[PDB]
Symmetry: D3
Subunit: 175 residues, 6 copies
């Protein structure tokens, strides 16, 4: 059912993000199980931190880590885990962990859901506070997980985010 959600109506400008974790929520790290399509509790986060945006993935995408492309979606109110939001990518936070590079895309609600993010075209239009919060969160959220750590390279633009979407959409397509 979540397994049948499209990657988007018009990828990569117009995508759907399947939400796993709300912004500002308790430290329960939910993940959609690939086989069942169900919402699984993956971990109880150990640090006293919360995701600054809603966090989820684009369906029918395959990152180089073997999981779908991760996305953060700011909204005026937290979303329900398992809900799906139509959005437009505007940027991407690049980083490295105990297993190679990682990226966290950022996408904003689509103009048909709200007009309040229309002026966010690219990564520099986003509030600097929000960006600095996101960066800080990912550097530190796994600090108390044994054998796990993260370090942040920096922020890239919407074109780079779209390229990640496309490469991973094409990579999942090709077996």
């Amino acid at each position: 059912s979540l397994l049948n959600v499209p990657a988007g109506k018009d990828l990569p400008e117009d995508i759907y993000v399947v939400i796993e974790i709300p912004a500002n929520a308790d430290p329960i790290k939910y993940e959609i199980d690939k086989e069942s399509g169900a919402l699984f509790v993956d971990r109880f986060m150990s640090t006293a931190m919360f995701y600054p945006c809603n966090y989820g993935y684009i369906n029918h995408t395959l990152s180089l880590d073997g999981d779908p492309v991760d996305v953060l979606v700011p909204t005026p109110y937290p979303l329900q885990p398992g809900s799906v939001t139509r959005c437009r990518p505007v940027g991407v936070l690049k980083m490295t962990d105990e297993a190679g590079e990682d990226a966290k895309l950022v996408a904003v609600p689509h103009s048909k859901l709200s007009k309040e993010y229309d002026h966010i075209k690219d990564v520099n239009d986003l509030p600097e506070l929000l960006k600095a919060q996101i960066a800080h969160f990912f550097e530190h959220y796994k600090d108390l997980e044994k054998g796990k750590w993260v370090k942040v390279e920096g922020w890239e633009n919407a074109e780079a985010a779209k390229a990640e979407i496309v490469a991973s959409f094409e990579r999942a397509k090709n077996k």
Copy 2:
């Protein structure tokens, strides 16, 4: 999965309502996507208003607008989006918008879920405050959406609500 929820055990007295939006919640207007069966964020409501009851639809029904029949369900506590409640229709709020007539049925929890609505047989048994809140909500909730408005005709009885259920159940059945 929600796609496989019946219209009811004994339509139109005994129906199931698939809940999309809780009573008294943040202004996130969720809708179940017809193809996928998933819970999609349709809009971030622009007015500072909330639904006075839980709001959802009856599955396997086709209104003249092309969507399933909408229903409001009062409960003592807000319900989870994506949950399904067995109820009994008691009434219907008629109205017109930028696209023709619309109706919002009202149904109360079934006696097997709670005895507290048993005395609500027809539309005049409902609290007048609740009715006036519902009417006011629908007149005003789209006031700040461009090219959108609503105006309310009035309240009709349980027989009329059941007729809407039946006509739309039969209309979906017939291709």
Copy 3:
């Protein structure tokens, strides 16, 4: 989708519990519908009580009452109804109601989700307060439901809980 959730990765030490009702929540008694797989509102609980743990079931199990095996899962934060948690059984509360014996297993989050329950190997490792709360809840929660009551026998160990899991997993398997 919840219908396709396994009983576990390695039953009966390593099981999945499909959550229906969060700990410390409003008195809405949700149940997963067996046919549809959807989350149904079964009852509005009449007593002013809440479940001391999250409450759910193990999929692909058949108790002697005809329903899957019920499980309580303590967590540091309440879980979302419809989510799935990997856990390890440590005990079981035995009791009788208006229809024969019943058991409520207790299982703790699996070590891959959290290290905080690792020291809970068997039923006596659980906080005595929590146990006494669970026992009291089940004795009294149906006190105001007509023709319904419950009485508690006592607590049995992890081996007994695992035997219930196995017997009901094998019972569902065999038509």
Copy 4:
């Protein structure tokens, strides 16, 4: 501040209830400290129960047990601990406990706050569910506290509640 809240505008028909505990809330039993006037955590409730209504007291009253008159107030949404609600008494639940007799008044929001309770004149106009819940709650909430118990004796009417208010206003 809470120390200076009136017992009421026109006692006993028109009173103020200082709220200590919301309806449907976590099992934290707050109580206003008499000396300071501050909101104290009195207990973490041991049973997995919640108060069916908001719970508090009428200021400037003293019951036989030396504490102010206790009151339950139903509202359409839970109230903030430390807030003060204008209400109209309608009933009283009589009980005994480990310390002896006890009484809990029930009062509904005053007509100037809401019309929704205008029809509740007396104890029997309250919903049967809510009454049954309250009785059950008080019967069982101390079940897991050693040496503490409650036996509910019964309900009494709005005249009975008003009489308690007056008598306890005078006692203070």
Copy 5:
């Protein structure tokens, strides 16, 4: 305690707003009782609406209607009723109602609490959505109270808001 909160550190550019109602909260209209200083439930709102911002007053001010100056304060998370927020006025919404003229100031968190509102100097720097919501909220929230209404006249600037603060500080 709330009775002893200053009007501000450096009125009218630097003020304190006592909060009565959170943004996005249940429809319970609290109001600080002038005599006691306690948080009273004034009304259960009849329309299914919520305040777009936190709402409260500046202490030691008196408006022509005999009540203190009312203020809306946007914050990134809702504030607790009875809490006090240091802010900077930026605007005012002018309206009339069943009692006559009314004005609601808007003030943003002071730079020492957050940098997020530094760029809001004047009424037109506020988001157009939020302004439209506030106006709509005040236009309609009393629609289901008999004999009560509001017509919004318009917005005025930060100088206008400051002038109201000063004048009302003096009136008290």
Copy 6:
């Protein structure tokens, strides 16, 4: 009201902590204003972190920095800002920051509120997770405030916490 809360019933073993911030709550840093006694919004926290325990102070204490003694209190459910909890000190976390040395006491609910913390006699009886979270929280929560930092030095025992309470009680 909060100004008149005792330091404790039997300091330093039996104290009262005035709560400013709940465990697991939105990133709003409230602080009781010393002059008024009212709950002020001191800051909107910039990092996406939450306090692992409820946080507050002991009234009628003064630390070397001129502010009252700070205390963390774990509870099974979060407490209301402005509420007062009877607890028993067990430990203290020592740190330094942009202003110099700092210390945060840890105290657990008193046995009359709950038996759940009776077994916690001293710093090492606290759960290792909670201790690690607290340390991490204080290490990082000011990471996005310019010119503000914390380096955690270490934990000290229940005797050390009691000594701080006494010394700071005397300083006031």
